[PDB]
Amino acid sequence: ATQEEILDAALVSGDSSQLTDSHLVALRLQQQVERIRQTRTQLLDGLYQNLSQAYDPGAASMWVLPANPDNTLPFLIGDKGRVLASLSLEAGGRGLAYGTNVLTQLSGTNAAHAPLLKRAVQWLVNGDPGAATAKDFKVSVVGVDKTAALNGLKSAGLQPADAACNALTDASCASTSKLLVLGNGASAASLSATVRARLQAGLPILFVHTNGWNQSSTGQQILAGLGLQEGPYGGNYWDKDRVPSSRTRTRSVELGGAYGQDPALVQQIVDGSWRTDYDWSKCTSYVGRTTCDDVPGLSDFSKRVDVLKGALDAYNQKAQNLFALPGTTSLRLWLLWADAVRQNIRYPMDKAADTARFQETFVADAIVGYVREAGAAQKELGSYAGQRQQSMPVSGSEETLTLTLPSAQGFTAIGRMAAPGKRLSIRIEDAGQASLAVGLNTQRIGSTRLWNTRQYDRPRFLKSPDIKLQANQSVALVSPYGGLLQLVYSGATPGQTVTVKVTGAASQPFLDIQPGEDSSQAIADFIQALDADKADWLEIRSGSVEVHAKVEKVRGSIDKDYGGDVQRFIRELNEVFIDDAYTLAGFAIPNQAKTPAIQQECAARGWDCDSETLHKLPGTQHINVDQYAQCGGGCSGNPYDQTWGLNPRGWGESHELGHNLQVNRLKVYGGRSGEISNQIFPLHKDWRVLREFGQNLDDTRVNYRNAYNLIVAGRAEADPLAGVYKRLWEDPGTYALNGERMAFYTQWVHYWADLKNDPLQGWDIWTLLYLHQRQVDKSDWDANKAALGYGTYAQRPGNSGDASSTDGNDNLLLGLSWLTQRDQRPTFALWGIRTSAAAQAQVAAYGFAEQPAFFYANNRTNEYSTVKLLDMSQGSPAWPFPLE
Ligand SMILES: CC(=O)N[C@H]1[C@@H](OC[C@H](N)C(=O)O)O[C@H](CO)[C@H](O)[C@@H]1O[C@@H]1O[C@H](CO)[C@H](O)[C@H](O)[C@H]1O
Numbered sequence: 001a002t003q004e005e006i007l008d009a010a011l012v013s014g015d016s017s018q019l020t021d022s023h024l025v026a027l028r029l030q031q032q033v034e035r036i037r038q039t040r041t042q043l044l045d046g047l048y049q050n051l052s053q054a055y056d057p058g059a060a061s062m063w064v065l066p067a068n069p070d071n072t073l074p075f076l077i078g079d080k081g082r083v084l085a086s087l088s089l090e091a092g093g094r095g096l097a098y099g100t101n102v103l104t105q106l107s108g109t110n111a112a113h114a115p116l117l118k119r120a121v122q123w124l125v126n127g128d129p130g131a132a133t134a135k136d137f138k139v140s141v142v143g144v145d146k147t148a149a150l151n152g153l154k155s156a157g158l159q160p161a162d163a164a165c166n167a168l169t170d171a172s173c174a175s176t177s178k179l180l181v182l183g184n185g186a187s188a189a190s191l192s193a194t195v196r197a198r199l200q201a202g203l204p205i206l207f208v209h210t211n212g213w214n215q216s217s218t219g220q221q222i223l224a225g226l227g228l229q230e231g232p233y234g235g236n237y238w239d240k241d242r243v244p245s246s247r248t249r250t251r252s253v254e255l256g257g258a259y260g261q262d263p264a265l266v267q268q269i270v271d272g273s274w275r276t277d278y279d280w281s282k283c284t285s286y287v288g289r290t291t292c293d294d295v296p297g298l299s300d301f302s303k304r305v306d307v308l309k310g311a312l313d314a315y316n317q318k319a320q321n322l323f324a325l326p327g328t329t330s331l332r333l334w335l336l337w338a339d340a341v342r343q344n345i346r347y348p349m350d351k352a353a354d355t356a357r358f359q360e361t362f363v364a365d366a367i368v369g370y371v372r373e374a375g376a377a378q379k380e381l382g383s384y385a386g387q388r389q390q391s392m393p394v395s396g397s398e399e400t401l402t403l404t405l406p407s408a409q410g411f412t413a414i415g416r417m418a419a420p421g422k423r424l425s426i427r428i429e430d431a432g433q434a435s436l437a438v439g440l441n442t443q444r445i446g447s448t449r450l451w452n453t454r455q456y457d458r459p460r461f462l463k464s465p466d467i468k469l470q471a472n473q474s475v476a477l478v479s480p481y482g483g484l485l486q487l488v489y490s491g492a493t494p495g496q497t498v499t500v501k502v503t504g505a506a507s508q509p510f511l512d513i514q515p516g517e518d519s520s521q522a523i524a525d526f527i528q529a530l531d532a533d534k535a536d537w538l539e540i541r542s543g544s545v546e547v548h549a550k551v552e553k554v555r556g557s558i559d560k561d562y563g564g565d566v567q568r569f570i571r572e573l574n575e576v577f578i579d580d581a582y583t584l585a586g587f588a589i590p591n592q593a594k595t596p597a598i599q600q601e602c603a604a605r606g607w608d609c610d611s612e613t614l615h616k617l618p619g620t621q622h623i624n625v626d627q628y629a630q631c632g633g634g635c636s637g638n639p640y641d642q643t644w645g646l647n648p649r650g651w652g653e654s655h656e657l658g659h660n661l662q663v664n665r666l667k668v669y670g671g672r673s674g675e676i677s678n679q680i681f682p683l684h685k686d687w688r689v690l691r692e693f694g695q696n697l698d699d700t701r702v703n704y705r706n707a708y709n710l711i712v713a714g715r716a717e718a719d720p721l722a723g724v725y726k727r728l729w730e731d732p733g734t735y736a737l738n739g740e741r742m743a744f745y746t747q748w749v750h751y752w753a754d755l756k757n758d759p760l761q762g763w764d765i766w767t768l769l770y771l772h773q774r775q776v777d778k779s780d781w782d783a784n785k786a787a788l789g790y791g792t793y794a795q796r797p798g799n800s801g802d803a804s805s806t807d808g809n810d811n812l813l814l815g816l817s818w819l820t821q822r823d824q825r826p827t828f829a830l831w832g833i834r835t836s837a838a839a840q841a842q843v844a845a846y847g848f849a850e851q852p853a854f855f856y857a858n859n860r861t862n863e864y865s866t867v868k869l870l871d872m873s874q875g876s877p878a879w880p881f882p883l884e
């Protein structure tokens with residue numbers, strides 16, 4: 001079959017599998033867009049003629065926008081570009097929608113609109129804005145006041161008659177009525193469908209919004225019946241847009257034809273007239289990542305491409321199949337064009353060396369329609385994936401999966417993949433109250449380094465839009481890239497399950513650790529899948545951590561750090577990385593009790609240390625492992641991004657995990673500890689690692705020596721608190737004095753160990769503070785405050801993360817004093833940390849002997865045997881380890 005014949009077919013079926021001739025599609029699109037422009041311009045010009053286009057809807061009005069651009073268009077666009085009234089040719093009918101009740105203002109505010117309105121009604125009734133309506137033409141008015149409506153029309157020089165029946169709901173009435181006027185008081189079954197069916201059978205409809213700047217569902221449903229849509233929250237309130245008396249015929253005609261359409265971009269595709277002179281010297285670079293926001297012209301180009309993406313992604317988000325929805329030919333053609341471009345793409349591309357291919361591909365990446373019965377695979381996947389992904393076998397039979405949502409909001413991996421260019425079908429059941437969508441992949445936008453020299457080597461948008469699902473309703477998907485399937489949720493109940501039924505998906509290697517239970521079976525299945533080597537991507541679920549990983553990066557890490565020992569890699573991922581962190585934070589981990597020393601401290605303290613209400617595991621933290629990251633070679637977030645692979649003993653891994661587990665009430669001076677209070681997690685791991693294994697990792701992070709220097713010198717000032725504050729916590733830089741500030745956090749580790757007379761117990765102090773803090777955060781205040789050393793507080797304390805707040809300092813002073821049973825203000829002052837009066841008074845009330853100022857000094861981070869205790873109450877001893 002010819003390319004021509006394939007395109008004709010695909011316009012109906014959506015199947016772009018054989019469609020390769022993108023210039024052919026571009027030409028068809030060129031003419032489609034041109035005839036839309038012709039239709040629109042001829043209509044508008046016949047409406048406006050040379051009459052005044054003055055129209056002012058006030059702030060108490062809504063914007064009314066086209067939705068289906070092929071068969072709807074604006075009528076009145078304001079000087080600020082707000083669409084204040086739209087026309088509809090949907091289903092071959094005729095309609096018109098205003099964002100306010102214009103009919104009640106035709107002898108007042110909008111007296112000057114009357115002649116234009118007359119032509120508009122002439123058009124509605126006759127199909128010709130120049131053909132007089134007959135005297136006493138029958139008008140049905142529904143959902144808005146009849147007499148005022150009819151009087152308005154009469155004010156415009158028209159002679160309507162009350163049809164005296166309801167043309168919205170009575171079919172006999174519709175067939176004899178010449179116009180229907182709708183407002184938002186209307187009642188009907190299937191309001192949108194009803195409206196559509198009347199339109200399509202030839203009843204002309206005039207809609208007025210009757211709720212000012214408020215939105216109306218009734219209206220939205222009427223508008224959707226016309227192929228229109230209500231504007232955003234607020235309506236015209238803020239902008240107060242209008243069309244002035246000076247607006248010309250030529251100008252409005254022109255805006256109307258051009259609205260939501262880009263014939264210049266289509267021409268550029270056709271001719272291949274891509275820009276050869278972009279000034280790249282204006283790109284800039286930040287931690288290895290080039291961006292080009294300030295290259296003249298570039299943002300306007302990219303923002304025009306964003307229009308098309310938004311347009312098609314609205315269909316993706318609502319799980320709507322474009323090829324099943326009538327009057328979508330322009331967008332079908334954009335989509336089929338884009339799929340044809342994907343047939344030819346080749347990597348890598350450079351912004352300078354490959355101007356034509358770069359810019360066309362740029363446009364094509366932004367146009368992907370996932371909801372469909374058939375479609376094509378992009379041929380080259382470059383730096384994302386390869387031949388393995390292309391060839392993954394798929395399940396012909398239906399597969400049933402059960403998933404647990406650990407928090408109320410987020411996403412979790414389903415455990416299956418879409419294969420490139422192959423239909424899968426999906427539905428979810430037993431969802432309770434949870435709101436649900438499906439999506440593909442986890443890459444963040446900066447992960448495609450298209451502005452880096454010769455690094456446009458993968459698609460811009462590997463992460464699909466979230467595609468909304470209904471309880472018990474199937475959706476058919478085709479991805480050109482293939483991808484890891486994600487269940488996106490909100491409004492869920494921590495610990496609830498969801499059931500996923502999927503047909504046509506592939507099975508990536510997937511390590512699914514089951515909470516508490518023996519996961520011996522799952523580990524060997526995973527290894528077998530890994531050894532089978534059919535996938536470019538894998539995933540891991542363990543505890544509250546999910547890893548979305550490029551297979552070869554993981555192999556590379558197993559090989560370099562574990563000599564190919566997969567089993568040890570997995571164990572250490574689960575135990576030394578994951579369990580280590582979450583156990584240190586005192587969470588309730590299934591089938592895993594607290595250590596004896598912690599259990600016994602919680603007992604003596606009479607605290608709730610194990611309930612799910614207070615200490616349940618938190619929301620999923622996601623980790624990406626890939627060739628690129630969103631920023632740098634590793635980037636904070638959820639997911640956080642890694643490019644080196646995945647090392648269970650890695651500093652980065654636990655540093656970032658730490659960010660997820662930070663809490664403001666354990667931050668010294670708020671953001672001053674933004675990159676400090678998370679470091680207890682990597683620090684704990686390295687201390688454990690040296691003891692159990694022998695590797696000595698990152699042994700110079702904690703700068704006891706220079707922290708000391710700063711303390712000693714800030715201390716000789718007249719105000720010793722402030723003196724130390726200036727030298728330690730004042731500097732607002734993101735990583736300022738990182739090693740020195742960390743030394744504060746370990747003080748309490750060495751202290752607790754001496755207090756418990758057991759070096760193995762030191763870190764328990766932080767685990768007790770986390771448990772204390774969650775009680776402080778969410779326990780019933782009146783009932784629990786006495787047990788938490790907060791009896792003097794009428795109300796729960798604040799949780800400000802602000803540098804100038806004492807919310808973090810206070811709780812640290814209270815918690816440490818309460819747990820240690822000593823008044824710790826001297827050592828807090830020694831570190832330049834101020835506290836509120838309330839907190840001061842509360843410590844006094846404990847009636848503990850003061851702990852005089854002290855300092856734990858060491859010349860190594862990970863090895864505590866050599867730590868030395870200084871008494872700082874009487875003066876400042878010499879640093880107790882020799883230089884140099
Ligand atoms: C403060 C800290 O612990 N930083 C380490 C952290 O940084 C994560 C992001 N990349 C970031 O926010 O900057 O994890 C990385 C990667 O795993 C490093 O260990 C960071 O330590 C810093 O490493 C770089 C070298 O890449 C420099 O030597 C810095 O001096 C060092 O602090």
Ligand SMILES: [Zn+2]
Nearest residue numbers: 636655659675
């Ligand atoms: Zn950080």
